[PDB]
Amino acid sequence: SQPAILIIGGAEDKVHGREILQTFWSRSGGNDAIIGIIPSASREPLLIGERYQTIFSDMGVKELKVLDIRDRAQGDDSGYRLFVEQCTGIFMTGGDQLRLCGLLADTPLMDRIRQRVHNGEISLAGTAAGAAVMGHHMIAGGSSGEWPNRALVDMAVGLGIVPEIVVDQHFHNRNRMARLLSAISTHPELLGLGIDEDTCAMFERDGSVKVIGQGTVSFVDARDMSYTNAALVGANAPLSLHNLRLNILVHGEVYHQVKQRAFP
Amino acid sequence: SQPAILIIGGAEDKVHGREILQTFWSRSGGNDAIIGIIPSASREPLLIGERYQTIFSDMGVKELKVLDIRDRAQGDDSGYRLFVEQCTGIFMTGGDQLRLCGLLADTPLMDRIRQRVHNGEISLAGTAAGAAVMGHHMIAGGSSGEWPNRALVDMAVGLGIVPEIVVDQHFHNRNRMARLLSAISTHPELLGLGIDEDTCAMFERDGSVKVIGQGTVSFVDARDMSYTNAALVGANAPLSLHNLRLNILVHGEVYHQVKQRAFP
Amino acid sequence: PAILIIGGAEDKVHGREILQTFWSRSGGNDAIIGIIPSASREPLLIGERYQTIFSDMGVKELKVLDIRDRAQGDDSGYRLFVEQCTGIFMTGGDQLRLCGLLADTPLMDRIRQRVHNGEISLAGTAAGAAVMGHHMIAGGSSGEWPNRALVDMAVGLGIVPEIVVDQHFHNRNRMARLLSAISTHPELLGLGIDEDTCAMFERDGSVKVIGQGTVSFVDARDMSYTNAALVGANAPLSLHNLRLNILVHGEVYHQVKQRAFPR
Amino acid sequence: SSQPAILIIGGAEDKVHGREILQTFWSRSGGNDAIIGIIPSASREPLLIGERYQTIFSDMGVKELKVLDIRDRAQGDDSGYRLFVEQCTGIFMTGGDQLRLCGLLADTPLMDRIRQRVHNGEISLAGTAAGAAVMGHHMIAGGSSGEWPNRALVDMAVGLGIVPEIVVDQHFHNRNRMARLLSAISTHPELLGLGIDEDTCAMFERDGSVKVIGQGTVSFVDARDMSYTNAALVGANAPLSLHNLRLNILVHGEVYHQVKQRAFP
Amino acid sequence: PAILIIGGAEDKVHGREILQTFWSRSGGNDAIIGIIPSASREPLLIGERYQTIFSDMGVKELKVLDIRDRAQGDDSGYRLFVEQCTGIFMTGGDQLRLCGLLADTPLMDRIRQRVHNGEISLAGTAAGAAVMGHHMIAGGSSGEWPNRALVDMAVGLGIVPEIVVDQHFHNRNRMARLLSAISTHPELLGLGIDEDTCAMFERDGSVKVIGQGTVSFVDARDMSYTNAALVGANAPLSLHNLRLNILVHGEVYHQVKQRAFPR
Amino acid sequence: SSQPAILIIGGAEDKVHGREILQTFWSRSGGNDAIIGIIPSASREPLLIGERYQTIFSDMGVKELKVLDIRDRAQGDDSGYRLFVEQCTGIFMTGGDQLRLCGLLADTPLMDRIRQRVHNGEISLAGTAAGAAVMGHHMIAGGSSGEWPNRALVDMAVGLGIVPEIVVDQHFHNRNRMARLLSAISTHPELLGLGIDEDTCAMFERDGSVKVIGQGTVSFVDARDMSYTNAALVGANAPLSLHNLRLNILVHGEVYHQVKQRAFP
Q1: Which residues contact B206 (CB under 8 A, 6 or more apart)?
Q2: One Pfam family this chain carries (chains D, F)?
Q3: Which residues from F are below 8 Å from E246, CB to CB?
Q4: Phi and psi (nearest 5°) for F247?
Q5: From A109, which residue of chain C is nearest by alpha-carbon distance?
Q6: What are the backbone angles phi and psi of residue D74, rounded to the nearest 5°?
């Protein structure tokens, strides 16, 4: 029941065993959990907030609240501030990652959530857009069907929960490898995580990353790159990336951030 | 003008500078070239054979012949045998790689082409389906939009021109990374080459691979893999692949097969 | 930063003027406030009440320092919070309970030090006000002339050692027990603080009165005579040449000048 | 001593044991030679309360007693009662309700003559409880406890003006009456406040000294050097401020000197 | 494997019986055939002609060993091909040219050795037939009685040292020059091979005749008398007790038995 | 020697220098005593060719010459010519065309008597070129060179049967006639083939010996011990096989002995 950060690739199971959502429930304190749901990424926040309210209520918790922030000023809310002081876990729904950042970045309520996560007090999960915002550097958009090039990926600032990574989501399902490689070419100091649908990278306080769920997490590491043309070529030109390390993990496998290596 | 093997990712430039096709022309002896065109992969062999006949004729060569093999028995042709004894280069067009192998594998005419290539006497190029057949192990088909799994990729036997590799083609254009990773999981001894449209991996006799053209070649190396679940899981289950080496190269860059490393 | 000594039953519903002042002096939106509900036998309920009020005003961080045994006075987590905080709020309940739990603990030593050094604000209401002096009124009745047996004297937390505090003062007719306390310790300035009233001690030595009622400053430092040394504990006390200043909202008692000023 | 005095008694005085306060009034009225009038007008049971004090003073031994049972203001004209006042050596005003006592006695010929004979030093005067409350010109007629000082807390009225420079409160600490006395002083700061406990007495001597006798305390509340009050600025229900008050709490044997404005052990 | 000695102008258009026999004895579809056009002053054209014929029949590999200077007899690439081949075909042209280019070269030493060891087949037509003996007819006319001056004797490649070959034999009336040669070397069996005819030497010592015309076996090994030692080069030669066998397609001359057999 | 003989001359014999062959015929015909008949019937210029040999033999010195100019087969009945044949010591048959010579002379009384007188050893007989070709019973009348042996190569006909056991060819090596002689022998293997060069002679002596005289060679082609031929099996244009032939090529001074079937130096 140790607090953790769950980075979920979207379209997670809401109907069957709900393994990823049950893990967030357990790491939030299970029957003792006080869980806040942030549906700000969505233009249907009532429907999506109610969906997760029903799921976590059915699992059994102490308290639930939808933190239904629709305008930056709605973060300035007495009940939401109190709830964040009391909570054991926060869940960020899908939608649009630029909308979620637009509404929550550089707000006192999000600064307090981030502080409580960084201090090891509460769990945080984000799915789809809620996963995309985890890095300092965020993939806000970008196509498939192209070789890697700077113009392929739309880069933005995320919420900086895990500043050393760049997240992509619905990863193999939407063929997003080239846009993630294009992001890593821009920021080769960052470990890239490409997270499939109904798959999760769970960050633990000891530096380990545990993979949970149906698909894969791709760890794309350019920290030992021998050469790139990135400095030499135009925005639409193909990128070269030499000596990348790739680790494709499934459920139960671990990537250790200190060791910079994966384990079965 | 040293003979080489050109593995072309499909949809190569036939109209503008024709850089890849001009390289094959030059490595076949230029104005002295005697070039055979094999359009067997295609169900429109007359049209596709004539297209390349016109291109190489315009560049200026000594002789051209379309080796229009449409049934296995049509390989048993006096003129085609003579031409293969005389030729300096062979070009295999696109179409369907299973059709091309169906018609040419385990035939004396293809055995003689392969011998003359292996002995360093003639150049060989293949585009699209003509690239796919270069390995001993061939990707005959497979979808995108999935995490890597054995069932994603259709494996077959190719013509074994370069037995140590597995080729994929139209690679980033058709989002084929997952099917190539699935192929390499099946055969981790083989270096995977994912070749984009209008891009070429040119194999030289010294072991170097020179990249030419518009896009990228992805070298996917599982020879130092630390772990895979491949032995443990079902045909439709996601594959894990730990400690892969990835090199994404562009025009002018080299992968050295002996050194197992890329250079700018 | 300031020390707010609050007479109990402060407004938690309307303008909340006294609690808003503590909020402001603790850094307002940037405040990091610890709530000590140790005086109370319902610490969860009373800690949640002030968590709700300070969250409504808006602060950076809150912690309920729920000390229920003296061993929690050694607790590294609570002691770490005290190093990080900008304000500490001590709730009502029973002042002997609060002192029993917190006095002569590392946690309270550091609260007292950070208050004395002018690093953090401190507020206490009701029992939390009573503990501010070195000498504390722990109990006592009304309806009697001043006599030592009327007042239960104890040791407080020594935040403001030169005063003796009484609280719910006119509301519970506590003047005679405060006079009885001052007879025991005439070197100490007596402060009798009404319900929903506050004596706010500033770093310049001024004491500003805030709220609904009065603060009574009872000064025996120039007393000409008392019978206190001569008489038993149940005997009436005489106290000659006391100075009394009764102050309302906006008025100031200056500790250096030993005199009061209108707004 | 048998020198006439004014005894201002805080109520519930000892009627059973040593009766020290009542014996002092007896002594200052001439002891065995005393001619004492009892005014029970404050009481709605004047017969019972008048008889109670008649029995006490008779037991001590006096020359003559009379209950001056005034029940209508017009009876302050009565020749019989006015004759007795010319003959008496002491007057005792019992407890009850101070507004009733003032209603019946103030600005009557009978009370004008008592006041004159007291001011001329011819007779002693004692009042207990309501009988104490009427001693000033300004009188506390009522008021609660359990509040901060405010003008609405205290019911001010006109007393008999025996000692015009003071305002008396009675049962003082026993009924927690300090806030109502402070409320009275706020708008009469020229007057010395005397808060007199049960079974305690402030005995005004002819030289200006005030001797405290009895079980409890007398509180002298002096706002004559007050530096500030908000009294003129605020409404009747608002809290009062009073800056630079002098307080003297005295016990048996101690003296407040009215000329010196100071207390002595 | 066999040695095909072909009398020139062999059928290249119809049944190609002689060339198909060489193809078969070289391994047919598995044959690795070298073509030596060195006898010819048009080596490219004649090498291409046989490349076309053998490609039409279908073989594994062809190489034209285009030796135009004796230095190419040292060439490692041609010498490597000779180690790998299953058959060698020597075209027409001029037999002195062919010997000038190939005799006493490492390349021809290894061809001769691999033929002698029974590893490869060898065929020669016209000039390529003439070079098969150690003693070679390089030239000479017709229309004369036998005399030494009629025939130009030279050294051949010594593939079949016990014979002397003549070619286009009856077509160009070459009997008198062959008799003149045998007078010089009566230990040697003379073979006069007609156009589009072949003497095929088998490893068992049999010689099978294939094709359109005749092979004349002219045997002076039992000669009773000749004037050859006594007379000048322009004098008529006498040759007594010669044995002559004229063979056609399907017939056999057995070298061990020294006699001919019908089909 | 002056012993009668049969001289079979291969054509183009020396008419200018030593005339060795023609001098041998002169000597064997009786030299200065010779009575020589010349048959120019093979020639279409019989006068010119007859006169040429008349001049040569006259220059050597003889008793009598006559040109037997037969131009029609009926003139083989002529009394004058038949008388001369009874008187003569030698007959010389000139060149021309062997079919013409046989047409005119064969199975005539004149030639029957010449043949009889030759067989009885009374006269010498010489023939050159066409005159040589007619000596056998079987005659080569024509045929080309430049081909392998085949029956169509040679034109076979009937000769005068002077020496029935041989088949003669003439101008032999000079006109490359070996293949046509082999073609003739293939289907008459009982006959000894004699291929006689220009200015060479096979001189048949009465004892069976054949002496070679002159410039070139005589080829004796003997298929009497032939082990096989395909001649009976194949068409006229097909190549002939001939196994186990014996060949003897003789020069001036050498002898072929017909009884021994062997040559001598």
Answers
A1: none
A2: Peptidase_S51
A3: 149, 182, 240-243, 245
A4: -125, 135
A5: C60
A6: -65, -25
| CATH 3.40.250.10 matches E2-261 | no
Rounded-to-integer distance, Cα E66 and Cα A66, Å: 90
Query: Are F250 and E240 inside 8 Å of each other by CB?
Result: yes
Chain A residues lying within 8 Å of B174, measured CB to CB: 145
- C-alpha closest to that of C199 among C246, C241, C157: C246
CA distance F39 to E43: 60
Query: Is CATH 3.40.50.880 the right assignment for the domain spanning A5-257?
Result: yes
CB contact under 8 Å between B196 and A147, yes or no, is yes
DSSP label at residue A122: S
Give the C-alpha separation, D126 to D135, whole Å.
Answer: 9
Q: Does domain C2-255 have CATH number 3.40.50.880?
A: yes
Instruction: Give bridge partners of residue C35 from the DSSP assignment.
Output: C64, C89
**CA–CA separation, D255 and D262 (whole Å):** 9
DSSP 8-state class, residue D220: E
Q: Is B237 left (phi over 0), alpha (psi -120 to 50) or beta?
A: beta
Kindly give, in sequence order, each residue whose CB lies less than 8 Å from that of residue B111, ignoring residues fewer than 6 positions away. Answer: none
Q: Which two tokens stand for residue F56?
A: 């040569």
CA distance F119 to C207: 186
DSSP track, chain C: -EEEEE-SS--SSS--HHHHHHHHHTTGGG-EEEEE-TT-S-HHHHHHHHHHHHHHH--SEEEE----SGGGGG-HHHHHHHHH-SEEEE--S-HHHHHHHHTT-HHHHHHHHHHHTTSSEEEEETHHHHTTSSEEEEEE-SSS---GGGEEEEE---SSTTEEEE-STTTTT-HHHHHHHHHH-TTSEEEEE-TTEEEEEETTSEEEEEESS-EEEEE-TT--EESTTTS-TTSPP-EEEEEEEEE-TT-EEETTTTEEE--
Tell me which chains share at least 3 CB pairs under 8 Å with chain D: C
Contact B78 E55 (CB under 8 A): yes
Chains in contact with A via at least 3 Cβ–Cβ pairs below 8 Å: B, C
**CATH class held by domain F6-264:** alpha beta
CA–CA distance, E207 with E186 (Å, rounded to integer): 20
CATH class for domain B5-263? Answer: alpha beta
Say whether D227 and C194 touch across the interface (CB within 8 A). Answer: no
**DSSP letter string over B166-188?**
EEE-STTTTT-HHHHHHHHHH-T
Beta bridge partners of D166: D192
Q: If residue A219 lies in a helix (H) or strand (E), which one and from where to where? A: strand A217-221
In three-state form (DSSP H/G/I as H, E/B as E, the rest C), the secondary structure along A143-180 is CCCCCCCHHHEEEEECCCCCCCEEEECCCCCCCCHHHH
Return the HEC string of F92-146.
EECCCCHHHHHHHHCCCHHHHHHHHHHHCCCCEEEEECHHHHCCCCEEEEEECCC
Which approach determined this entry? X-ray
What is the Cβ-side half-sphere exposure of residue E107, based on CA atoms within 13 angstroms? 26
Give the chain A residue whose CA is nearest to the CA of C47: A86
* Distance of residue D199 Cα from the nearest chain C Cα, in angstroms: 12
